[PDB]
Every structure is written in structure tokens, then in C-alpha cells.
Design a protein around this nucleic acid. Structure first.
Lengths: 41, 280, 76, 208, 97, 97, 86, 93, 97, 79, 105, 94
DNA sequence: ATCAATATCCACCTGCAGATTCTACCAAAAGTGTATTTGGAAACTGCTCCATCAAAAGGCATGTTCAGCGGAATTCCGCTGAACATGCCTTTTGATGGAGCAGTTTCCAAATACACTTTTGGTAGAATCTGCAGGTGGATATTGAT
DNA sequence: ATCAATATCCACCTGCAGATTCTACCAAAAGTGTATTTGGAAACTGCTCCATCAAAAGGCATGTTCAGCGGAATTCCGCTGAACATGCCTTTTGATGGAGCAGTTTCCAAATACACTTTTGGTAGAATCTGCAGGTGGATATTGAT
């Protein structure tokens, strides 16, 4: 089990909860903020 | 004891017989040897360790942000607040080189810019010039000195024609003081000779004097010093502010060799926005 | 005094540091070029990745000792 | 002018935009130690007789640093006193907490990952820092062999040391000062985009 | 509260400020100015408040004279406003030396 | 009896006497014939208070406070060519647009 | 030690646009801008030209304050006397 | 010095129209006027009597001085009141 | 029998008169002018030769000063001509009336 | 009779062109005569009261050079 | 036998000391340390006449006569203001032409 | 028949700097008027400040501040310098 | 571009006004010791006055946006200076008279000093009160989108 | 044309603030009276510079053509008055430090004044060369016709 299935399915969504704390600037418009973190792939 | 301390000192890649005395740590004088390497700058006197005790660290590059880069030499920026110690010893690297200015007061309130050779492994310093924070007495630069291994290929000059660029990259004029110069007496004169003739070839004339300070940031109190360092650049203002001329131009035809010591005016900002009102 | 002079000085040692979220990506954005096409230099991606917060952790020495100096006055 | 290549090992890679960098000395240079030459080769004089376990050249250079961090940091008022510090078995509380080359402010958030070989590797200590061995265990393993040499080392100069030195309102302003902590974890967790790649990426071949 | 033509509240302001008699540049930044253009000449001197008062009325008389003759220059130039060229013209044939 | 007040001019002829002596340099000053001068400092100083009877004729308010004093000197052209050199304090400008 | 007293030797040449009040003490209408920098320069020039010979009067007088009397004498010989204020 | 022209400009304002009132700083204004015009006439009168190789001051060179430094109509009224008061001093010994 | 370009001989006229230095007005009409303008103040004066010489170089100095500043006001007015209005306005803003 | 017309338009044409003018508009002549008579009377009045003082009923060069030294237009050379 | 020109000066000490006694709004004047002033005019008549023959040789006339004085007594930048109130007799006007008139029309 | 000018002194100072010179008497009068009225200028303003500084002996240091005060800058600096060396070399009365 | 037509730069020629030495002379002063009388250099110590410094109230300085108009460019289009040239008009020159400028000697008169009173004008203790500056509501111009 | 809310002038009451008029010390200059001194007033004498007065020529005067030129107009556009919402730093009144002014007092270097006594810098003639002012003339630099 440690060789077959774990290696991506536990890694498919960890990279996409950034999109609730890139919104930490609101609480300038900068909605499409692609400065630092959106292009790390 | 204003003479050089001991009989042989290497500075990284080459030995330098130093010029003057520095406030070096005194207790290393009874053994006959002092040596010092490039990027740690922590002082020793015997090669018994840094033959492989520079496996203390893998520092290849100083923490100055390399703010220009070219085909041949780069340079960077140190402030005295984000670092406290190796910013300090670079002066004591060369207080044995510099003739007058030494430390009693701590060297923190000065920004510190240092010129540097590209290298195959880690890029090595050649010069240093020291801008203060804002408006000491004008005086846009301070102590400027090049490492004595590496002069006469013309690299000691292009950093005193970087120095005037960060004055109208902040949009106020500036110029050095007197303090003393017989060691480089004609050197800043050489650039202040050709800082004007290389950019008096375009004017569509009837041009005044003070806009030169607005365009080359070389001030009003020394344009006339350079208008008399070389030939007659007057006999026209007689009821108003000074006027400048041109002549037979045996200068720009000699401006094809000894011209390429330039900079590409294309890189980053240099404003310190904070105040840090210093008192001690 | 304990609020006043101790206010802002934890930002100019971070005035060099907006650079952490601008040090990092274009050399991870240049080593993705190394895996888009056997594990020779593929080890060293993490050893510059783990240095992300490492000085911010050294700032976390300071940016939680300054919070730990909330009680230096009787009000805060 | 031939001493170059014994201390000129290393590698180099060029820039991508500009070489931006920021550090201090004591987090770039790493360690803090210092030796003589007459303790380099003949303080370990007859260690050839009885070198069952570890005896190399480059393993005793780290623990020569850590003990003198007690004096200049934990007792700063100790400026000239010859009756200076407690003995090696009496300074046992000075090993559970210390600051040797700023260790525990470097080793406080280091166990949340547990990399498969071993955890934290920095680019700001040199290349060979693992079998450069952990001093977690070597106080109670070979800690006593360096103490009595140190216990006579400092007292010939007793108060300064023989290596060189340096001769002679609340409202509406401090509120973003705690709002610079919503970066509480947001750098390493998306360093953990790919810092969970490596514990299983390194070993794909072991079907064969 | 609809706005009238652009200009007449400025002209009522010039008649107000002309018929009035107060001092116009605010005093303590001007005191800071005369200090920190004074101590560059020689190090720390002190003042007394009547002397800096005389400074500010002297300089306001001088540059209101400079503005009145550059206004006559601007009305000479078949223009209604002032520029840089008429102000250094007016200071020029004033003979500032 | 008293040398000023017998003479019908009431400024002090005694105090004008040594002020020539402490200042002039031909080292002898005529005694009685400095009186001929300080007629004039009476006659001028009348001729800036006597046409400062304008305010008591038009400017309605009786004790004469120093912006009133800017309605005679430059403004009244006969006195202008004796006081260009003086710029009076806190007075202002005579009105014109 | 202390060795130097506080100095705010910085950008004080920005006074205010009260030049847009004293312009309107003069008879001038709308002002067209971009003159504020050289009128601040000329205010700096005339002020330094009066204060430096005033402080030569003070340093001649063996004092280290200025007073109203020697500054009104200073601008009196400078070419235009401030009048009735000392 | 420790001197003034205060009470004399009080009395001249009182010998003209008695209604108005001398104010606080206006006496310094008028004092500066009378001291400045006196210093003016004194330096040009002394220089006149100097450059004509003469060795005293009299009535007539300060008469020519106050004619020399004024607008015309005020000079004529000034020299008239000057001659009037000097001859009224000369009438009685 | 050749007409030059208009105005280009004016520039060599001004170079010719500017390089030379001699007293350019002619002396005896000026001498009659100064005599029967001195007649009005008291009759029957006589002059000295160096005195009238001082008068003529004084008046060409003052005249050449007023011509250069009215020329500079003229070229301020985007105008290569000098007219009544610019000589009297330059006359005003150099101060004297 | 008048003799202020004794100075003529080539003469003040030359006196203007010494300053550096190109064009001369054809009615500046009468007021340049006016400004010359104004300056000339303002200097000869204090010169004549200088000579009326010293009991010599001629002027000299010394009193007119002292007169120009009075009124802010100090000539040199002749005293 | 040195007649009081012995501070390296070559102007008459006796006549300047009698002339300060002549001018003398005050009473007394320091007969030894009034030497300070007539050396001070030795600067700016020489630094007036050293720039006189500074370019009087550029016109190649060896006896230097009245016009070339003004051709840089009023063109020397700082000796202008010490002589601005003077208009020296028959010494000419500097060669200056504004370049708005020279436009090749 | 007696009158005194500054002819021979100005002749000697400028032949002594530049030997290849000659002087017209008109230019000699122009320099005589120059030196005379700048003399009287220093005299009157020096005497005025020494008057109102509660003082009667016309000493050297007030003419030093006077020559600093009315002469323009750079020439005032060189002037006060050679005046300082002049009263230095006169104090040694050897 | 390619020459006619000016003309200024350079060089050489004599005439002459004139600067430069010179030098005697010489009346007039710098310059010399000798007391010397006092103004000044300096130093005492009291103390008025400047200078940092702060807390809260609030007018006012910065920024930003919008409407529009004054600046400016470019144009056409009468007109008045500039440029020659001839005609004349008074100049610029040398040559003979005459009232003031500039020395002198004496006559008296007015200013020095010096002191003896003595009114008078600066200072402040201090009444006083009214002449202002300021609010505040009652009559009257203010100059447009509609 | 026209009403629109805005800004302006005026009688009326109110705190406050510095004139202003004694009280009087009081200190100190000023009127007044001598004695003698040196400087101005007037008269003179004579040596001049100022006024005035005739015959060659260059610079003014009054022209006529023509083209650079100013003036008028008209439209286009960026950049400036005006408003409003908001930050900020003035903005006045205490408050303690602390010191540099300032009056006084003091002893002493030194500029005035004085008879003499020597050189020494004006001056006035005067040789006398010479520097340059003017003129003439040859060649390269400059400008307009085509």
C-alpha cells in the first residue's frame, strides 16, 4: 500500500487550499494576485 | 606606529604588502605572520587552520544584493543595521590601506557598497564606497578605496562613475568633500573632466549651467572648478548666470579608447525609507 | 517607552524580507525544467526549499519574543 | 602563491534574475569554534591505542565549540573571575538548555516532518554535516576528554581570552504589529508542496 | 449649492488677503526652516523670537514684491497667469546682484 | 527759558545737539544752528501723522493701529520717494487688482 | 558620549502652499503651477543671504544668540530696512 | 540706547488733532522713522562739510542737505518751516 | 547697386558698435541741451569740459542699461521689436519713478 | 525754444543698437527723449545745488561725480 | 631702514592711517593694527589687475588702457558685484548677443 | 598747490606682479576712484558697526568682520587670509 | 553646390601724442622716543530668557477627481521699419577776448571746554476703563443654469 | 428674464488689555555762565579756463520699395481652480532645565599727543623712445545670386 496508491491521492488537494489564504490581504484591488504562490508547480 | 604592521599578508588570492597601520587586534604581532581570506574576513595569523577550516562555512557570496552585473565586474550593497560584524571588518580590512579615516565611533550608520570581480567559484571584492543615510553635509559619497592587487585595468574608476548615478536615482544632487586626495588626486578629476565633454556633444546650444546639475548631478560648486580645470568655458554671461561654451574638440576624438568604463542604467532602486534617528 | 521605541524595528529587518516570497519561485521555476523531461541532481530541490522559513524562523525567534514582551508593561 | 587549491574546493551556479541574499554571520558561517595547532594533532596523541570506535580528524571540531558558549552567554557578568564555572558533571543543566552556535532556536521546529534518512539540511552549514556527528549523545559518550584540557586552557589568560577580540500609549499603532503573524505557517506548508515529494521519490527502483 | 463660474472666489480671495494685514506663512515651520538653514553656516546658534518675527515679515515683504512685479511681467506678456520664465525675467531685470 | 520750548519747535534741541556730536566727524558742531535742522523732523513727522488724519476721517475707529499707517507713505506718492528704503511691519499693501 | 545636539537637517524646503496665499496678497490671479520649486529656491537664497551676514554681526559681537537689533541692522545695510521692529 | 522719541511724538500728535490714539508698535514705527531720517541727513551733511574742505557744520549746509534729499514740494515746505523756526530762535537771545 | 537681406546688416551694425567703445552721441547738441535745461534752476551758470563729459558718459551708460533690459523684456514677449509699452514696463520693474 | 530734438534718431538708433536691439518701432523716439530729460534733470538738479552751496557759480567735474555717487549711479574716472 | 611696509605690503600705511583718522565717526584707531586693511585692498586691486592683464595680452596691446578693464571687470564673476554700482568711463560694453535674434532668418 | 593720489603705489603693485605693463592716466584714474571709494566703503560700514557695538577704538577684528561682510564670498576669504598673514608678519617687529 | 562681391585679418609704413623714467628739489610729513591717560580685555556672579518637551483640540494641508478655459500652435494678412541714395545741415575744427577760482591776511565771533545747579524725562507701581475684537442675529448685494 | 442659497454690512453687548496719567524717585543731562581758543567772513590779485567766433566736410533727413513682421483669429487640449473627504501636525499653554547675557568691577596694554629729524614721494620739466592710431594694401573668410 506504501508503493502503489498513496503517492498522489494524498497530494492532489494540499496545493489548492492556498486559495483561501491568498485572500488574506482584504480583511488596492489585486484580485489576480500571481506574485508569489500561484505559479509554484 | 603609523606604518604597516607585519611583513607579509595575503588577501585571498594574492599577497599584499599593506600601506599603513590599522586598529587590528594587537596580540597577533609577536608571531611574525598575519593572513586573511576573502569572504569570512575573520582574522588569523597562521595557515594552520584555513587550509581546510574554511569548511567552517560554504559562503561563496556576500549577503549584499548584487545590484548591477555586466560582462566583467558586479557590485552590491551592505547596510550597517541588518548586519553588525562582517560589515564592520571590511573597513578594518582596509584601514591599513586607507590613510586617514579610522574608527572610534562604530561604523553602523553608513550604507556600504562594494565593487566586485566575477570569479569561477565566488565573486571577489575590489572596491568599497560608503554612502551615509541622508544629507550629512551633502557629500553623496565617503571613503572610496580599491583593493591594491587589482588596479590599472581601469576598474577603480567606474565605481566613482557609479556613485553619481544613485543621486538622480533619488533626484537630489551631490558631490564629495575635500578631505584629502593626493593618492587619487587626478582620478576623480579625470571623470569630472569627461563627465561634461561626453555629454556636451548634443545640447542644441544656448544652454545654462544649473541644468547640468539637473542632468548629470555634478553640482554647481564644482562645474566651474572643472570649467577651469580645462580650458576657457566662459566670456559670455556678463549680466546674468554663467554660460558654457565649446571649442575645437580634440577630446571626443580621443573618446573612443578609455570610454567603455560605463554602467548600464537599468537596475534597481536605492531608497532607504526609514528614518532611524541615531544619537549614540 | 516599552510600546513606543519597541514598535516598528521588527519591520526593517523584514524590510529586506518581502524577498522570501520572491527569492524562491523562479529557481523552482527553473528546476521544473529538470523534471519535465536518473536522480542525479534531483535531491537538492528540498535543501533549498526547506530554507524558506528558516530565517523567518529566526525572525520567529524575534517575532515571538516581541509578542512575549507584551507583559513588560502593566496594561498590555 | 600556491596555497590555493587545498582551500579552493566548492561549486558555483550563476544567477536567474539577480543574486539576492540576506543573512548574518552567525547563521551563514554556522559554527563558532577555534583551535591552536598544538592541540590539533597532539591533543589526540596516543588515541591510536584504543581507537575501537570513532577516531577521525574531522569529528572533534564541533564539540570543541559548544562548551565555551556557557561562559559568554549564560554568565555574562563573569568578566575576570578565576573561580569561574562549575565542573563538567556540574554543568549538566547547561546541556539540556544552551545556545551553542544558536542551536535550539535552529532546532525547535525541526521534528514535524521526520525525513526518511534524517531531517533538516541547510545550505548555510557546509556539505558534510551529518557524520559530522550529533552532540546529542557525545556529552555522556566522550564529553570528559575535552573538559580538563579546556579547564586549564582559559585560565592562563583568565578573563579575556587568547584568541583576538574587539578592543574599546497603546492606540492604533501596534495593530499591524501583531497582524504580521498571519504568516504563522504559510511558508513551509507550501514548501511542503514538494517537501513531501522526497521521502518516496528517492526509491522508485526497489521492485528491482 | 450649485457652483458658479470658475474663478471669482479666487478673486474674492485676492481682495480679502490684500485688504487684510496678518502674517501669512505659518510661524513654527518657518522657524524650523531658518534654524536649519542657519546652523549649516556655523554650529549651534540661538535666536530670539522678535528676530525671527522680523525675519518672516522681511521675507514676506520681499517675495510679495517679487510676486507683484512678476504679475506685471505676466500681464505684459499677453497672458493671465505666471510661468517660470516671467519670474526669472522679473528677478533678472530687477538686478538681484 | 527751556531752549526747545521757547523756540516754538517742541522736539528737544538739546537731544538733537549731541546726536550730531556723537556721529559727525568734522569734530565741531555749531550750537544754535542745529536748531534749523530739527524743525525738519518736526515738519516731516507732522507730515506723516497729519495725513494720518485719513482714518479719523474715513476709517471709523479712533486709536490708530499700525495697518492704518499703510495709507500714507508709498501709497501717497509725495511721501513714496522718501520711504522706498523702509518696509513697514505688519501693514500690508494698498488695494489694487 | 552625547557630543551633538538634535538636528532636523532634512527637507524643510517644502514650507507649504501658503505661496498660494501670499501670491494672492499680491495682485496675481490663477497661478499655473510648476513655479513652486524655484520660488522655494529663491526664498532659500534671499533668506541665506540675509542670515549669513546677520550671523557675522552676531559672531562679531562675541555673542551666540541673535537679536532683533542686529538683524534689523543687517537687513538695513543689506539694502532694505525692516522698519519699526527693533 | 536707553532713550527714545516717545513723548515727543505723543505731544506732536496731541498738538495736531487730539482725537486719535498712538498705539503700541506705532511708536516704534515712528521712532525708527525719525532715527533713520536723522542718521541719513547726518551722514550726508557731514560728508558735504567734509568734501568742501570745510571744518565745521553750520545752518546752511544742513539746509542744502535737506534740500538735497527730498522730493521738491516737501523740501520747500520743510526749508520754509526751518527758516521760520531758526529765525524765531534768532529773534530773542 | 546691391540690396542685402533685410536685417542681416543690422547684426553687423550692432557688432560694429558693440566692439567699439568711443562716446557715440555727438557732444555739442547735448551740451546745448544740458545748458538750457540747467537754465531753469538758476540762470547764468557756466560749466566745465570734464563736467559735461561726465554728463554724457553718464547718460549713455544709463541709456544703454535701459535699452538692454527693454530688449530682454522684448524677447521675453516672443517679440523681436521694442515698443513704448515694453520700455516703460521695464522702466517700472527696475524700480524707479 | 526746444532743443531736446537736438538728439536725433540715428544717434539714439546707435545708442539702442549698442544695447543689442534689431527692430526699432517708430514711436519710441519721443519717450526715449522723455526718459533722457527725466534722468538728466534729476542729475543736474542735485549737481546745481552742489555748486550753489560752495559759493562757486560754475559747476565742476568733482561735484557732478559726487552727485552721481550720491544717487546710486557712481561714475568713475573723473574724480 | 624699513618704513613700515615691512609686513610684505606695498601701500602707504601713513596715509591710510591718517585717512582712518579722517573718516573717524568714532574717536581712536589702532595705528599698528590698522595695517590689516591696506593689505586687504592689496588683494582686490591686484586680483582686479591680475585679471586685467590676464587677457590684456590676448588683445596684444602692451600698455593696458581703459576698455579691457570692463571686458572682464564686469565679466569676472565675483568682481562684478563689488563693482556693480559703477559704470566705468568709456570702457565699452561686453560683446553679448542673445541667441533668439541669431536664428538664420 | 598740493594734492595727493594713489598713482605710484598702484603703478608699483602692478609692475611688480606683471613687469610688461603700462598705464594710461585715464585707467590710473579709474583705479584711483576704485580704490578710493572701496576704501571709504569699508571705512563707513566698519565705523558704523564699531559705533553701535558700544566701542570707541577702531580695532582690527571689526574690520576683519567688515571685509568679510561687504566683500563677496571667495575674494572675502582670500582677503581675510592675506590680512591675517599680514598682521602676523607685522607683529614680529624684527 | 558654384562662384561674384564684401570685408575683415594680417602685415608694414610713418607721425605723434604721450607715458615712462629721472631727478632736483622740497614742503611736507612718517617715523622716533617719552610719558600718559584711559578705554578695553577679561573675570566676577546674579538671573531673565531661550529650549526642549508634552496633551489634547482643531483648523487646515494632502490627495484625488472633474469640468473648462486659457495657452499655444498655426495660420493668413495688412503695414511699417530697414535698407540705399541723394541733398543739405550743422558739425568739428583752430583762433582771439574776460569774469571767476583759487591763493593770501586779517577781524571777530562762536564753539569749545568746565562746572553749578535743576528741571525733566525715563521707569515702573499701578489705577481704569474704554477702544478694541469678537460673536450674533437683522437688512442687502451676489451673479449663474434654467 | 430669474430665484437661488452665499457672503456682506451694522447695531448691540462683552472680556480684556494696554494706553495714560499721576507719584515720585532720581539720576542725569541741559540752561547758563565764563576765557580763550581757532575757525569763518570779507577783501583782495591775477592767472586763467570759459565764452564766443569764422571756413572744410561727414553725418542727418527725407525720401521710395518691399518683406520680415505683429496682430487677429480660431480651434485643440492638458492642466488648474474648486470640492470634498480626510490625516496631521500644528497650536496654545504650562514646566523645568540651565546659561549665556549683562551689569559691575577690576587692573593694565597701548594709541594720543608732543618736539625733532631724518627720508621720501609729489611735480614739473623734459628727453625721448615707442605703442599705437591711422592708412594702405594683399589674402583668406563670409554672404548672396542662380
Amino acid at each position: 500500500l506504501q508503493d502503489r496508491r498513496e503517492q498522489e491521492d494524498t497530494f492532489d488537494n494540499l496545493q489548492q487550499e492556498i486559495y483561501d489564504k491568498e485572500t488574506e490581504y482584504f480583511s488596492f484591488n489585486n484580485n489576480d494576485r500571481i506574485f508569489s504562490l500561484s505559479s509554484a508547480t | 606606529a603609523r606604518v604597516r604592521n607585519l611583513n607579509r599578508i595575503i588577501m585571498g588570492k594574492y599577497e599584499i604588502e599593506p600601506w599603513y597601520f590599522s586598529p587590528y587586534p594587537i596580540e597577533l604581532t609577536d608571531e611574525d605572520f598575519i593572513y586573511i581570506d576573502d569572504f569570512t574576513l575573520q582574522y588569523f595569523g597562521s595557515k594552520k587552520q584555513y587550509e581546510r577550516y574554511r569548511k567552517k562555512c560554504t559562503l561563496r557570496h556576500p549577503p549584499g544584493n548584487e545590484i548591477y552585473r555586466d560582462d566583467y565586474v558586479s557590485f552590491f550593497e551592505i547596510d550597517g543595521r541588518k548586519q553588525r560584524t562582517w560589515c564592520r571588518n571590511l573597513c578594518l580590512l582596509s584601514k591599513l590601506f586607507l590613510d586617514h579615516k579610522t574608527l572610534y565611533y562604530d561604523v553602523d550608520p553608513f550604507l556600504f557598497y562594494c565593487m566586485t570581480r566575477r570569479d569561477e567559484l565566488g565573486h571577489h571584492l575590489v572596491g568599497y564606497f560608503s554612502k551615509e543615510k541622508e544629507s550629512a553635509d551633502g557629500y553623496n559619497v565617503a571613503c572610496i578605496l580599491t583593493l591594491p592587487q587589482y588596479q590599472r585595468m581601469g576598474y577603480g574608476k567606474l565605481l566613482i562613475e557609479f556613485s553619481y548615478e544613485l543621486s538622480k536615482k533619488e533626484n537630489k544632487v551631490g558631490s564629495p568633500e575635500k578631505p584629502l586626495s593626493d593618492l587619487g588626486l587626478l582620478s576623480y578629476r579625470a571623470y569630472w573632466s569627461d563627465t561634461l565633454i561626453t555629454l556636451l556633444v548634443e545640447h542644441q546650444k544656448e544652454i545654462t549651467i544649473d541644468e547640468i546639475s539637473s542632468m548629470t548631478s555634478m553640482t554647481t560648486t564644482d562645474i566651474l572648478h572643472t570649467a577651469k580645470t580645462l580650458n576657457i568655458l566662459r566670456y559670455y554671461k556678463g549680466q546674468h548666470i554663467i554660460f558654457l561654451n565649446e571649442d575645437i574638440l580634440d577630446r571626443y576624438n580621443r573618446l573612443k579608447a578609455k570610454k567603455r568604463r560605463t554602467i548600464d542604467p537599468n537596475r534597481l532602486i536605492w531608497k532607504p525609507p526609514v528614518f532611524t534617528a541615531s544619537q549614540l | 517607552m516599552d510600546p513606543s521605541l519597541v514598535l516598528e524595528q521588527t519591520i526593517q529587518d523584514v524590510s529586506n524580507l518581502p524577498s522570501e516570497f520572491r527569492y524562491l519561485l523562479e529557481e523552482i521555476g527553473s528546476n521544473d525544467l529538470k523534471l519535465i523531461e536518473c536522480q542525479s541532481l534531483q535531491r537538492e530541490k528540498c535543501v533549498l526549499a526547506n530554507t524558506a522559513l528558516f530565517l523567518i524562523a529566526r525572525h520567529l525567534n524575534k517575532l515571538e519574543k516581541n509578542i512575549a514582551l507584551l507583559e513588560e508593561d502593566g496594561v498590555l | 602563491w600556491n596555497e590555493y587549491d587545498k582551500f579552493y574546493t566548492g561549486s558555483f551556479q550563476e544567477t536567474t534574475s539577480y543574486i539576492k541574499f540576506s543573512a548574518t554571520v552567525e547563521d551563514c558561517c554556522g559554527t563558532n569554534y577555534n583551535m591552536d595547532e598544538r592541540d590539533e594533532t597532539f591533543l589526540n596523541e596516543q588515541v591510536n591505542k584504543g581507537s575501537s570506535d570513532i577516531l577521525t580528524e574531522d569529528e572533534f571540531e564541533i564539540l570543541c565549540s559548544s562548551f565555551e558558549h556557557a561562559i559568554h552567554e549564560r554568565q555574562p557578568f563573569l568578566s575576570m573571575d578565576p573561580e569561574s564555572i562549575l565542573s563538567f558533571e556540574e554543568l549538566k543543566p547547561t546541556l539540556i538548555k544552551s545556545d551553542m552556535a544558536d542551536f535550539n532556536l535552529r532546532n525547535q521546529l525541526n521534528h514535524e516532518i521526520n525525513s526518511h534518512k534524517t531531517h533538516f539540511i541547510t545550505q548555510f552549514d557546509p556539505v558534510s554535516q551529518m557524520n559530522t556527528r550529533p552532540l546529542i549523545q557525545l556529552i555522556e559518550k566522550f564529553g570528559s576528554k575535552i573538559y580538563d584540557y579546556w579547564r586549564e586552557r582559559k585560565i592562563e589568560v583568565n578573563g579575556y581570552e587568547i584568541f583576538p577580540q574587539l578592543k574599546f500609549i497603546d492606540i492604533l499603532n501596534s495593530q499591524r504589529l501583531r497582524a504580521l503573524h498571519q504568516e504563522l505557517k504559510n511558508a513551509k506548508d507550501l514548501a511542503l508542496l514538494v517537501a513531501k515529494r522526497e521521502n518516496v521519490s528517492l526509491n522508485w527502483i526497489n521492485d528491482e | 449649492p450649485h457652483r458658479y463660474k470658475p474663478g471669482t472666489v479666487a478673486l474674492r480671495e485676492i481682495r480679502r488677503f490684500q485688504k487684510s494685514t496678518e502674517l501669512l506663512i505659518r510661524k513654527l515651520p518657518f522657524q524650523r526652516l531658518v534654524r536649519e538653514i542657519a546652523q549649516d553656516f556655523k554650529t549651534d546658534l540661538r535666536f530670539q523670537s522678535s528676530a525671527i518675527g522680523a525675519l518672516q515679515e522681511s521675507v514676506e515683504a520681499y517675495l510679495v514684491s517679487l510676486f507683484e512685479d512678476t504679475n506685471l511681467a505676466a500681464i505684459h506678456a499677453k497672458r493671465v497667469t505666471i510661468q517660470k520664465k516671467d519670474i526669472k525675467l522679473a528677478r533678472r531685470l530687477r538686478g538681484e546682484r | 527759558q527751556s531752549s526747545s520750548a521757547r523756540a516754538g519747535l517742541q522736539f528737544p534741541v538739546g537731544r538733537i545737539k549731541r546726536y550730531l556730536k556723537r556721529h559727525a566727524t568734522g569734530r565741531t558742531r555749531v550750537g544754535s544752528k542745529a536748531a534749523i535742522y530739527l524743525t525738519a523732523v518736526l515738519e516731516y513727522l507732522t507730515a506723516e501723522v497729519l495725513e494720518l488724519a485719513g482714518n479719523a476721517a474715513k476709517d471709523l475707529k479712533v486709536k490708530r493701529i499700525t495697518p492704518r499707517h499703510l495709507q500714507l507713505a508709498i501709497r501717497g506718492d509725495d511721501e513714496l520717494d522718501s520711504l522706498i528704503r523702509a518696509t513697514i511691519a505688519s501693514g500690508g499693501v494698498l488695494p489694487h487688482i | 558620549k552625547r557630543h551633538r545636539k538634535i538636528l532636523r537637517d532634512n527637507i524643510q524646503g517644502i514650507t507649504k502652499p501658503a505661496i498660494r496665499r501670499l501670491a494672492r496678497r499680491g495682485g496675481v490671479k490663477r497661478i499655473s503651477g510648476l513655479i513652486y520649486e524655484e520660488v522655494r529656491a529663491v526664498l532659500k537664497s534671499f533668506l541665506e543671504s540675509v542670515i549669513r551676514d546677520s550671523v557675522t554681526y552676531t559672531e562679531h559681537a562675541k555673542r551666540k544668540t541673535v537679536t532683533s537689533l542686529d538683524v534689523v541692522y543687517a537687513l538695513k545695510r543689506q539694502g532694505r530696512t525692516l522698519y519699526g521692529f527693533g | 540706547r536707553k532713550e527714545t522719541y516717545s513723548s515727543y511724538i505723543y505731544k506732536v500728535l496731541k498738538q495736531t488733532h487730539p482725537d486719535t490714539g498712538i498705539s503700541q508698535k506705532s511708536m516704534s514705527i515712528l521712532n525708527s522713522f525719525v532715527n533713520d531720517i536723522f542718521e541719513r541727513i547726518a551722514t550726508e551733511a557731514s560728508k558735504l562739510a567734509a568734501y568742501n574742505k570745510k571744518s565745521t557744520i553750520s545752518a546752511r549746509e544742513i539746509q542744502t542737505a535737506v534740500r538735497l534729499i527730498l522730493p521738491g514740494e516737501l523740501a520747500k515746505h520743510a526749508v520754509s518751516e526751518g527758516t521760520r523756526a531758526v529765525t524765531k530762535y534768532s529773534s530773542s537771545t
